[PDB]
Amino acid sequence: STGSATTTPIDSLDDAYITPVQIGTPAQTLNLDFDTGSSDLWVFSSETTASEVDGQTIYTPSKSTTAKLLSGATWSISYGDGSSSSGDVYTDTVSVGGLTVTGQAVESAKKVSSSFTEDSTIDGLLGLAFSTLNTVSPTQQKTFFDNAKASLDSPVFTADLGYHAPGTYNFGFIDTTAYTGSITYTAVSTKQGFWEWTSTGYAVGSGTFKSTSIDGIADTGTTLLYLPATVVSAYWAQVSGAKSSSSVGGYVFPCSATLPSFTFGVGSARIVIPGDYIDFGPISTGSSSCFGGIQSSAGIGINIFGDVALKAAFVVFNGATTPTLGFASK
Ligand SMILES: CNCc1ccc(Oc2cccnc2)o1
User: Fold this and answer.
1) Is the minimum distance from the CB of 221 to ligand 1 under 6 angstroms?
2) Structural domain of 11
3) Residue 138, preceding bond cis, omega within 30 degrees?
4) Atom 2 of ligand 1 has which residue's CA nearest to it?
């Protein structure tokens, strides 16, 4: 089997991407944030504290003839941006782009933090990291990909995120029309539960490429590109007036600037992020200071190849017996 679903930016900045997901019988369609950096499929629901729901579509398990309470199971998660959610667990039929999993754990939120409430466009998350990170207790649950894998034509999924435009998540096949050139595959460590890999270096604009190993994770659920302070300083030094602002929380730059590109290495290959992908717009409405899309990972403890980087590539998440990651230009 295979599946194919369109993923759409939530706003004009590409702050996140949402993909429609069918849950239950009859189908209830929710728009979920597919997150290769976490491993829980959780949704706003009829159980979510009412004051914490503000425009989201909810899953109502009592209206699904295939829903079953997973008795005694609870979940609780917190993300790198400080947000969190928790609740109880059902199993139900879940379909993505025509690919169906029966008995998928659907984690129903009883509580969500303020930034979830405030994001009316995101009805929940669909985790695509390794199932060892799943938070369900006392019986840990598998991701949608893990459950689907044996039925897929090939044990892969691909992320093809758009810049200010829709894109695609495919399961079970590689669309050879969706990229240019060849796909370069690189090793993955699953020891931390992430799609963790090592980039071979970087370049700023037209500058010479610096060969240096940068360990990090491929994370569709993180908006920006978080890299070591040395790398980030070298980038922003090329932008007149850019500076790190403690009050804003990162590098800012004049909105009047045209930004240089940023290149990252994948083995001997190179992925070029155009400068415009690095502009996240005014820090506050009407400001002429703009927020940068490349930020320091110092104090995160890991480098993160988030959407800024991934949307410059066609990315293969290869879940074969030894997982790997592939990147192609597009
Ligand atoms: C804006 N915070 C709530 C929210 C929306 C989407 C996500 O999910 C995230 C956020 C950061 C990293 N990984 C997943 O959180």
Assistant:
1) yes
2) 5-174
3) yes
4) 115
